[PDB]
Amino acid sequence: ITGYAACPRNWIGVGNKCFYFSEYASNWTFSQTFCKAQEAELARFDTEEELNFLSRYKGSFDYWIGLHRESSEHPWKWTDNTQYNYSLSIRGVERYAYLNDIGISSARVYADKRWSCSRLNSGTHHHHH
Amino acid sequence: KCPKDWHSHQDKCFHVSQTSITWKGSLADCGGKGATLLLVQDQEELRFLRNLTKRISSSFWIGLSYTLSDEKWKWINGSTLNSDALNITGDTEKDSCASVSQDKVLSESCDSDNIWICQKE
Ligand SMILES: *[C@@H]1O[C@H](CO)[C@@H](O[C@@H]2O[C@H](CO)[C@@H](O)[C@H](O)[C@H]2NC(C)=O)[C@H](O)[C@H]1NC(C)=O
Ligand SMILES: *[C@@H]1O[C@H](CO)[C@@H](O[C@@H]2O[C@H](CO)[C@@H](O)[C@H](O)[C@H]2NC(C)=O)[C@H](O)[C@H]1NC(C)=O
Ligand SMILES: *[C@@H]1O[C@H](CO)[C@@H](O)[C@H](O)[C@H]1NC(C)=O
Ligand SMILES: *[C@@H]1O[C@H](CO)[C@@H](O)[C@H](O)[C@H]1NC(C)=O
Ligand SMILES: [Zn+2]
């Protein structure tokens, strides 16, 4: 840990990450173009500490997260196209992942669900042209 | 006229079960309590439930589902959907189940998890 430094207002700091939870629902494709707009990505978890937080903070709404697959057959991948390697299996037959009250599940692009954004930490700012 | 923590309106009682589950699973929960998934009377009772759930969940399950053999939506009461009476946004390329977003009604994977609302009278 290079040093301590707060997350910006409206974001919640957990480990080397900053999390955001949207206030209105939307489709997956929009949710992402909104995270990207904030120099961020659809929420990703790497620790358990992170996933545990996501699960608990969530509250009654389900939230879109970083995981997509090209189909029911092909494998789960984060926003950056890293393979998903974590032993919570994503429920559902579908191509876009969101937070159930019972873990992670999957629905079609056009489902109307809130969304979460994740970004890594730092005390000054490094820009994605 | 409604059991405790059930919300009455226009001579039905409603209940918003506090857990997200699949379509089939929701059907069974209601059906096992002597109730049913929603059977949408009018574009009013939709606005009501939509208010009732506005603070809780971004969409919910209703007793309506597309059966790739028929190529027909069907209320859980037998009756084919009167196409005039509801516009349903989504792909109908595979079996689908209807969830009611705040502003639309959607054709969803039946294995997606969702808040469901139980109906009696
Ligand atoms: C995902 O949602 C976005 C916004 O919720 C939709 O984009 C809108 O599309 C209409 C015409 O398609 C425009 O007039 C709106 O102004 C758009 N809004 C924004 C913010 O872009 C988009 O259509 C949705 N995608 C899917 C697949 O349903
Ligand atoms: C199954 O339920 C649907 C409603 O959920 C019934 O169709 C509706 O009936 C109303 C009231 O008579 C009509 O005004 C509408 O055309 C229908 N509503 C919609 C939204 O389509 C259907 O008849 C029911 N079947 C039985 C056995 O009662
Ligand atoms: C994939 O999962 C296994 C868990 O046994 C682990 O050994 C491996 O390091 C993981 N992948 C990556 C990219 O670390
Ligand atoms: C919506 O629901 C709340 C909580 O039940 C209720 O108190 C209120 O009267 C309702 N508002 C509208 C606009 O229907
Ligand atoms: Zn910047």
Q: Residue B61: which of B13, B34, B85, B28 has the closest Cα?
A: B28
Q: Residue A115: which of A107, A123, A124 has the closest Cα?
A: A107
Ligand 2 centroid from CA A36, angstroms = 44
Q: Residue B45: which of B76, B14, B2 has the closest Cα?
A: B14
- Residue among A25, A61, A107 minimizing CB distance to B112: A107
Question: Where in the sequence is the domain holding A24, given as residue range(s)?
Answer: 1-129
Q: Is B51 in the pocket of ligand 4 (CB under 6 A)?
A: yes
Instruction: Return the percent helix, strand and coil in chain B, to nearest 5.
Output: 20, 40, 45
Q: How many domains are contained in chain B?
A: 1
Resolution number, Å = 3.0
**CA dihedral defined by A74, A78, A82, A84, rounded to 10 degrees?**
-60
Cβ distance of A92 and B89 shorter than 8 Å: no
List chain A residues with CB under 8 Å of B18. Answer: 60
Question: Where in the sequence is the domain holding B55, given as residue range(s)?
Answer: 1-121
Cβ distance of B56 and A60 shorter than 8 Å: yes
Ligand 2 centroid from CA B105, angstroms = 16
Q: Are A28 and A109 in contact (CB under 8 A)?
A: yes
Q: What residues does B60 pair with on adjacent strands? A: B100
Q: How many domains are contained in chain A?
A: 1
Q: What residues does A117 pair with on adjacent strands? A: A20, A42
| d(CA A44, nearest CA chain B) in Å | 20
Q: Is B8 in the pocket of ligand 4 (CB under 6 A)?
A: no
Distance CA B76, CA A126 (A): 55
